[PDB]
Subunit: 454 residues, 3 copies
């Protein structure tokens, strides 16, 4: 990686990442088969097979009141985002589910899987899904369990059938309670909905080129992490559900992250403070720049960053000029201002930015040595090669130990160009040139008053 400390805007920009962007969803439709349990009875009394069999029958009866979408009746850019990714994900899932719930669709899907256990099918709206069938419990019930229970006797002396049936209905019971606890729309794929072999077999079928397929096949955990399952229904004795997986269609494209801390200048005891408000992630793609402002939707693993294209905002390319000359650009650089200092530590991938003002004591130290030194007032960039912990008055922060190259870009701070008297009041996500306009307009009105003497 490579990290620059920008003295002027008092912030830091770290480059050298590579993106892995989600660009669509892939749907797997699972048909879990249970068999003819609702046709088997027991009359001996208390036993093991009877307990397990009553659990299975009750699970089927319970799952028929759970519905994913039906009621059974028998400019602050960090705020414009924040709720887009999940809303879009759920909207797409329910939109496909509405199409699979029809009787013609389920009939076609079950006819595909009549003689196999996986088949690629096309729904009625032209979408291609992958249908797969789970048939272990059904085969055990038809071939083994039913033969043993002949005359409604279940207090038999086998006890191998009892333990076997306990082994075989575990996945079914787990699927049922995961859908029943979560109102029919789970928020993550467990190992009961989609196990590991089926995750690999679904990744091998996605509609992308070979490079992305290789990346996902090797890092399946991060493809399972961003999916969810939706219940379709209980048809006959089959529990039908679906699983939505991401498609990381665009890989290895530039990214960078911007971090910042307050920049405050003092004169005669009065302060003038700014703070850059365009922090977060930026990703290039096909010549266009996308800004992800809520850092809870991008996840790094190494120097790769996994991102969600539905949670970003398109920004012009001239937006990379706030990192070169924040003061005299044309782009509307976003800043927040104030008249009261804040002391804080903003950790960045290769170090920290410490802001130490009027009444706070800061220091840097290591593990084997202890307090290495103190720090002067103002803002400082502490690389993670010269320190291990950074201390504000009593708080200790542990720097991350990533390896990279650090640079410092010289320049007198912008906050030192103001007069702490005549500074405008507090602002929230304005452009910097509007701050300069406020000051200029006040000067102009005072001059207008002064010219008029008479």
């Amino acid at each position: 990686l490579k990290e620059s400390y920008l003295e002027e805007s008092c912030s830091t920009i770290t480059e050298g990442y590579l993106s892995v962007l989600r660009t669509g969803w892939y749907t797997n439709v699972f048909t879990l088969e249970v068999g003819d349990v609702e046709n088997l009875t027991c009359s001996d009394g208390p036993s093991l097979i009877k307990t397990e069999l009553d659990l299975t029958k009750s699970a089927l009866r319970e799952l028929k009141t759970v519905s994913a979408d039906q009621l059974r009746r028998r400019f602050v850019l960090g705020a414009i985002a924040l709720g887009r990714a999940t809303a879009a994900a759920v909207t797409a899932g329910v939109a496909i589910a509405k199409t699979i719930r029809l009787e013609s669709e389920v009939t076609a899907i079950k006819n595909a899987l009549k003689t196999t256990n996986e088949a690629v099918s096309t729904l009625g709206n032209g979408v291609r899904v992958l249908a797969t069938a789970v048939r272990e419990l059904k085969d055990f019930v038809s071939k083994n369990l039913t033969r043993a229970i002949n005359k409604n006797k279940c207090d038999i002396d086998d006890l191998k059938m009892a333990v076997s049936f306990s082994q075989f209905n575990r996945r079914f019971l787990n699927v049922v309670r995961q859908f029943s606890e979560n109102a029919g729309i789970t928020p993550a794929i467990s190992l009961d909905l989609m196990t590991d072999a089926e995750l690999a077999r679904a990744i091998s079928n996605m509609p992308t080129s070979a490079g992305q397929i290789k990346l996902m096949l090797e890092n399946r955990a991060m493809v399972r992490r961003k999916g969810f399952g939706i219940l379709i229904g209980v048809y006959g004795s089959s529990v039908i559900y679906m699983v939505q997986l991401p498609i990381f269609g665009v890989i290895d494209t530039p990214c960078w992250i911007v971090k910042a801390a307050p920049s405050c200048s003092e004169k005669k005891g009065n302060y003038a403070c700014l703070l850059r408000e365009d922090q977060g992630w930026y990703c290039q793609n096909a010549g266009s720049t996308v800004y992800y402002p809520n850092e809870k939707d991008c996840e790094t693993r190494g120097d790769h960053v996994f991102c969600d294209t539905a949670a970003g905002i398109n920004v012009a390319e001239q937006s990379k000029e706030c990192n070169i000359n924040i003061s005299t650009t044309n782009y509307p650089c976003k800043v927040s201002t104030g008249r009261n200092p804040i002391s804080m530590v903003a950790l960045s991938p290769l170090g920290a930015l410490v802001a130490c003002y009027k009444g706070v004591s800061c220091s840097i130290g290591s593990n084997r040595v202890g307090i290495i030194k103190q720090l002067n007032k103002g803002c400082s960039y502490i690389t993670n090669q010269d320190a291990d912990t950074v201390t504000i008055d009593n708080t200790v922060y542990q720097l991350s130990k990533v390896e990279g190259e650090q640079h410092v870009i010289k320049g007198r701070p912008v906050s030192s160009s103001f007069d702490p008297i005549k500074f405008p009041p507090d602002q929230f996500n304005v452009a910097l040139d509007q701050v300069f306009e406020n000051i200029e307009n006040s000067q102009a009105w005072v001059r207008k008053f002064d010219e008029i003497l008479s």
Copy 2:
């Protein structure tokens, strides 16, 4: 449903929903009985019964250090909300728990269930709760297990008792680890705290009319979804806990949702942008209107929307005139402004609102025939009977496929009345009439300077 696209404010309002509002809590008190495992020993050596029995004893000894409310010494309306619902829920739960932890209360509760397994009791503060007892592990320990383990031997050749005991203590061990892992206050009801039959038997006892009782009995999943459990304690060998369930007292009352996207007008290359800020849900009730501003607390299931009355804000009845006459109403309709366009897509229940400005390319297409057409600059409303996917420069969004009636309400945009020069700086949740006040005050001051000639 029915959705209108409002041109002047550049937003959309969807009506025809029906509410299901939470209006209180119902409390179930569970007494889970374990028996005299604490005075059963073993001396043979490793076996199955010994392993299971050590697990049960350790679970009891573990649960006695877990406490839920003691330490053992042995005007931006989206910000005023956001934390009310969950804080109120926990406050009510702990307020009742403080009353059940007394020894007189637990004595009375255990005396109610002496000869039955469910009884409605009244606490000391006049609240009526439902007390229920779970007695399967205890009966197994007293009747079956104790007789077999007679001379401190457990390496017996039965092995039906070992498997039975493993079946019987599963619920106890699950309850214990759910409370131990969550500090004593779980955030959701599992099938171990309260199973399905007990959920139905508690819904049948709530203090509401028959219509709401019918709705809740048929949609139990969404009544379990909004509860939580609190540990009361370990008394003797009984684990006593409680479960809080919602009471959806008010059903089938009008609701609507409001969505919006930026509305920007260009003159000589300078933009004036305005965005509507009163988005989210609104519900009538008894002639009053309640505005739910955080869309994370209202959840739809078809025509109906499930809402939490503690997370809403009472708004005036004229707040629905911002959807008719946004410029000339007396009501203070909230807007945000700016001078820099944003391009984005705001998905509404029957379509999308696309805002496409200076440097972004947009298109609409479907699943079968691919890209259908491009879009002109500005903001436009795209129904979901017209397209399937909407594309911003490289992002693709899949519309929801709900069925309804879409209307368009004509009008010249508000943003086309401003002069992009002489536009006020960025604002955040101001009323629109204050924007007009800023412009008029500046005009008047300039006129005052111009009149004075001398």
Copy 3:
């Protein structure tokens, strides 16, 4: 506790808490041993041992594609916070994990545990961790399972080995599931990562005085609640992972909480409204004051509060003067303003603050008696000793029943000082003295025009 209702600022301050502050992390390194399962085969067909053994082998094969940090190629103070605590926690965890993944480190750690099952070791960077080994499945496989399965026969008539092996590999399969579902970094410690006895043994070894050790040993649930586990890898047949636990180094230090609700004054039908914006928690420590603005990071159990020093902001000790003299302090008291009333209820630990305005009906009542009385317009403080529920037009809130001493402080509201005409537009987190300066500047300009007559 003790709670004051401040009438001038229309807010409430509750004191008498004691803090339990986190000041560092402690690392446990677990080595879970599986044995030579990948060396055992079966050739009889279906049985119980074969099913369990295939599950164990598949778990090992599955866990080798999960990575916690690598990609396999094989001034609004409430916004400046909000993401510091979790980012810092994960940064520290991954920083230590990068050091334990080296082969020299794992070799040294495994050499410590050669002849014992717990040992305190020091890594290569000087940090001291606690290494512990889990050896039950491995000993069962070497001593019992391997001998019985002699010539690839597993359809044997034991059935005690089958149940025993089901009992023994449960913890291993659960650990593998928890790391595989969560991409290799779980967000909480379950009872499978670190059980209870090992939590007690890790707390006994922390680097703090005896008093903090005693507090943590007695309230272990709240120490497990704030940790997480990270996967280090699979080495041979050993699954190596780590667990990060908090160190509550500073205990029993003063805290207080500040709550507030809108304060609006009416004249001739026009309202001037003011709301106080420095709400949340405050803690002393060593003569400094720390302000925690996001209430989601501080959690109370009794009159104790479990804060997190990485999520707070250092504030000057004159900040408390906002609770005594909000108008004339020499301190930037943060307020929001408006011209439209809001009616709402802010629940404070010993009562509620009800704001009732233009068109809202409020009342207070109890359980046994019902509606006790109505409330006048304005803001009022309802202690939790003369009421149980507070009702806004149709919403009912249940007060908390904590016991303390309530105390009202006299004074005329600040909002009665303003003129509802000539009130500045809506503000958001400005200092109060800036509002006064705004009004004064407007008066001065009007006077300047009035003086000039000519």
